[PDB]
Design a protein around this ligand. Structure first.
Ligand code: SF4
Ligand code: F3S
Length: 106
């Protein structure tokens, strides 16, 4: 599985969904996750994310490991998203800001 990690939060560009051949992205108010059972590890979404938030599960930084099960948990409860939409307002201001997990909205 690939995993969405902290910098997606409050940015949510959604550039990643357009290349996902299996549509396994799931949508929160201010964050996206990857459903690890449906994801086929094609890696195509990784270079599409301007916030560089997406990692292969085995390359998730040590300080963001919590995001692995968080993706799995929220992918079960959020609605599927298969089409690009406008990034969140002020996404540029939050791109690069650390510890945005504290801002995650369910
Ligand atoms: S790695 Fe491929 S299948 Fe998995 S979330 Fe990214 S685009 Fe979709
Ligand atoms: S910011 Fe989030 S919505 Fe997709 S393009 Fe990057 S993982």
């Amino acid at each position: 599985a690939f995993v969405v990690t902290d910098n997606c939060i409050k940015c949510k560009y959604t550039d990643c969904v357009e290349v996902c051949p299996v549509d396994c992205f799931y949508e929160g108010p201010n964050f996206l996750v990857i459903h690890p059972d449906e994801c086929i590890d094609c890696a195509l979404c990784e270079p599409e994310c301007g916030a560089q938030a997406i990692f292969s599960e085995d390359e998730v930084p040590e300080d963001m490991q919590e995001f692995i099960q968080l993706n799995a948990e929220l992918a079960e409860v959020w609605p599927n998203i298969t089409e690009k939409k406008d990034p969140l307002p002020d996404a540029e201001d939050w791109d690069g800001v650390k510890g945005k997990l504290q801002h995650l909205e369910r």
